[PDB]
């Protein structure tokens, strides 16, 4: 389930589909909020893929299957210089027998950085955590405490009155 290639959608289909996935998760109040101001088939495929499971799709899964046309046109463009330079690099660079010494590899681990050879998934995200509800922002705007009396008045200080003679 790793080798599967993304399908090359057209751009405005890709961005429109991408924009929908973000809005359904990080800006859930956007569609309703559009109405107060005034007053394609791809996204249908994504919903129908897992109609049984109500879990909305994520940004990663959308881009793990759907990719734009330029992001897929650029890949073939860059695959040519890699495959073209392969031939360029390979041309630029009784009885008894003779000595044999080691094995030769064009890329060393001493002069060039080597390759890689070593359940791995985590970091769930709360979408509601990314914004502040209007109800909460109302609460943290209301002054409220026990007012402490000033030490002195017009003439008691610390409560005990200033004594006259009379």
């Amino acid at each position: 389930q790793t080798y599967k290639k993304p399908i090359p959608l057209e751009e405005d289909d890709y961005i429109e589909g991408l924009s929908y996935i973000i809005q359904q998760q990080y800006f859930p109040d956007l569609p309703k909020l559009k109405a107060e101001v005034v007053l394609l088939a791809i996204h249908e495929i994504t919903k129908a893929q897992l109609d049984g499971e109500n879990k909305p799709i994520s940004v990663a899964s959308y881009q793990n299957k759907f990719t734009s046309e330029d992001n897929a046109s650029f890949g073939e463009l860059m695959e040519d210089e890699s495959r073209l330079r392969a031939e360029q690099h390979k041309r630029r660079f009784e009885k008894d027998k003779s000595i044999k010494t080691w094995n030769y590899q064009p890329k060393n681990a001493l002069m060039y950085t080597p390759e890689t050879n070593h359940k791995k998934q985590s970091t769930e995200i709360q979408a509601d955590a990314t914004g502040l509800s209007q109800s909460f922002l109302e609460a943290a705007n209301q002054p409220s405490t026990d007012p402490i009396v000033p030490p002195s008045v017009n003439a008691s200080v610390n409560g005990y009155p200033l004594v006259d003679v009379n």
């Binding site: 790793t2 990663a60 681990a109 080597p114 390759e115 890689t116 050879n117 070593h118 791995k120 998934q121």
Partner: protein, 33 residues
């Protein structure tokens, strides 16, 4: 599909992978006497 961070990168196979499971792999960094 996961990304490997630079600190978590491993370039070389484990000694058990390269030598098999029938060999005693000893890593004696520190003295015992």
């Amino acid at each position: 599909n996961a990304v490997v961070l630079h600190e978590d990168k491993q370039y070389y196979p484990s000694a058990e992978e390269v030598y098999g499971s029938n060999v005693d792999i000893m890593v004696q960094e520190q003295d015992t006497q």
